[PDB]
Amino acid sequence: GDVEKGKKIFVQKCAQCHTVEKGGKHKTGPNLHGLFGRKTGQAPGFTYTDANKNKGITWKEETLMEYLENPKKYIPGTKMIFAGIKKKTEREDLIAYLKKATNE
Numbered sequence: 001g002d003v004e005k006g007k008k009i010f011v012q013k014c015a016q017c018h019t020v021e022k023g024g025k026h027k028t029g030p031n032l033h034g035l036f037g038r039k040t041g042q043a044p045g046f047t048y049t050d051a052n053k054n055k056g057i058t059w060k061e062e063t064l065m066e067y068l069e070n071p072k073k074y075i076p077g078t079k080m081i082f083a084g085i086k087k088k089t090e091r092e093d094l095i096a097y098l099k100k101a102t103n104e
């Protein structure tokens with residue numbers, strides 16, 4: 001969980017659709033600094049495509065571990081234009097971005 005790159009690689013490409021700031025009218029990507037509290041698809045106003053909006057759990061390190069680790073095989077594939085990183089563990093680093101954000 002290298003939040004160092006977590007908040008980085010996150011705010012690098014995900015900063016665009018996921019500007020982590022006051023939620024409010026969400027956009028293509030809601031400030032995912034509360035994923036552990038955001039349903040698999042319950043973004044206020046931005047109700048994820050039936051895919052995430054039809055799950056039933058919350059973005060917990062494990063659930064997202066299945067998404068960030070298998071993004072094009074979990075969700076990141078419909079609108080998300082991302083689905084992998086240079087190496088591979090780069091996804092665990094983001095879990096540090098949220099696990100820390102979402103946590104508090």
Ligand code: HEC
Pocket residue numbers: 009010013014015016017018028029032035038039040041042043048049051052053059064075078079080081082094
């Ligand atoms: C950095 C690697 C990123 C993280 C972490 C997340 N995203 Fe995104 N994202 C985008 C869209 C348009 C969607 C909706 C997909 C659809 O409509 O089918 C999403 C979805 C997510 C979700 C799902 C949360 C839920 O409740 O369903 C998570 C957890 C998430 N994203 C985290 C848009 C973009 C985007 C635009 C180009 C980027 C760069 C990212 N997302 C990157 C990340």
